[PDB]
Design a binder for this molecule. Structure first.
Ligand SMILES: Nc1ncnc2c1ncn2[C@@H]1O[C@H](COP(=O)(O)OP(=O)(O)O)[C@@H](O)[C@H]1O
Length: 241
């Protein structure tokens, strides 16, 4: 929940207003910016908070396995079924094959799963949250994302700022992560960051955002290993000698 940058606080405000709706929300942001945490917040601030919160990463599964995991087969209940009365979070949405996109639109618009065999369709009641860092309108133009799915899925859009655009939050979060690492390795006090360390942290572009910042800071505190003088060496790249 860390951050004071205006851009982040505006996201939290937006989320508070979107959460009670049953409308789909699209979250745009880089890796490590907190997208799944925001999806979770949408669920727990909604009327569905006692229902299930289910997640699925679309990039992780090949096309036939993604189809079965999302819509079910035979049985093997899919993630829409498991999310009935709750919220389903679809991460890396732009990697979904076009077959899955069309089937997703069908579920959104008709509210049921189709299914094979003698079974009747399964009606489902699921609040959808999706995330990506792709330019979805650009993909629509290329024919790699369905325009009709976007016209429907993007009821509203939450844009999470990358850490490099929340420059004020870098030192706040670095200090928080450093202190927790000091507890983990039993140092009595975090001895601070030198100006060199601060320059290194603030100049780096953080392609992995908060996840990367946490790891870099934890590693740096461990390598420093003392409370006797301030931390000077920020180890961004551990693959260097
Ligand atoms: N506002 C925040 N304050 C503190 N930690 C955060 C914040 N946002 C994200 N994190 C942390 O950064 C890491 C990445 O968060 P996550 O929600 O998985 O990002 P994404 O889903 O975009 O990859 C997690 O360890 C999470 O706890």
């Amino acid at each position: 929940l860390l951050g004071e940058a205006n851009s982040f606080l505006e996201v939290l405000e937006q989320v508070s207003h979107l959460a009670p709706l049953d409308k789909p929300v699209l979250i745009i942001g880089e890796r490590g910016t907190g997208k799944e945490l925001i999806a979770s917040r949408l669920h727990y601030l909604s009327s569905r908070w006692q229902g299930p919160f289910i997640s699925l990463n679309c990039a992780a599964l090949n096309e036939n396995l993604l189809d079965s995991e999302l819509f079910g087969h035979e049985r093997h209940p899919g993630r829409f079924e498991r999310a009935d009365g709750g919220t389903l979070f679809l991460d890396q949405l732009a990697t979904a094959p076009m077959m899955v996109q069309e089937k997703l639109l069908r579920v959104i618009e008709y509210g049921e799963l189709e299914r094979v065999g003698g079974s009747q369709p399964l009606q489902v009641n699921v609040r959808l949250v999706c995330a990506t860092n792709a330019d979805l309108p650009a993909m629509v133009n290329e024919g790699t994302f369905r325009a009709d799915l976007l016209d429907r899925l993007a009821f509203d859009v939450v844009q999470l700022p990358p850490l490099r655009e929340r420059e004020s939050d870098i030192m706040l979060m670095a200090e928080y992560f450093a202190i927790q690492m000091c507890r983990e390795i039993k140092l009595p006090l975090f001895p601070g960051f030198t100006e060199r360390a601060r320059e290194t942290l603030l100049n780096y572009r953080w392609p992995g955002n908060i996840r990367e910042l946490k790891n870099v800071v934890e590693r740096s505190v461990y390598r420093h290993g003392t409370s006797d003088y301030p931390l000077d060496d920020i180890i961004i790249d551990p693959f260097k000698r």
